[PDB]
Amino acid sequence: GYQPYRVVVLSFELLHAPATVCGPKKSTNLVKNKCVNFNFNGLTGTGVL
Amino acid sequence: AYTNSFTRGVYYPDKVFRSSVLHSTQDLFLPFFSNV
């Protein structure tokens, strides 16, 4: 009951700082001035730009 | 040769930016009118 794994950990932070880290997908180009939803850098919302 | 504080140790609490926000906080901060 002590077979080997070398423990591994999560990393995670709650908005308290600059945004820098996520695995890039298509990474679209932005529009403006038309109430459209955004998943902006992971932080999401709808409204205008 | 101690020396009293008037107004020191005032720092925006985190990288976040509030804007015209009469806000409040609490963490390890500077006691006021204390003597350094």
Ligand SMILES: *[C@@H]1O[C@H](CO)[C@@H](O)[C@H](O)[C@H]1NC(C)=O
């Ligand atoms: C600050 O506090 C110390 C400790 O009681 C006191 O001796 C001093 O007179 C006070 N005022 C100063 C340093 O201006």
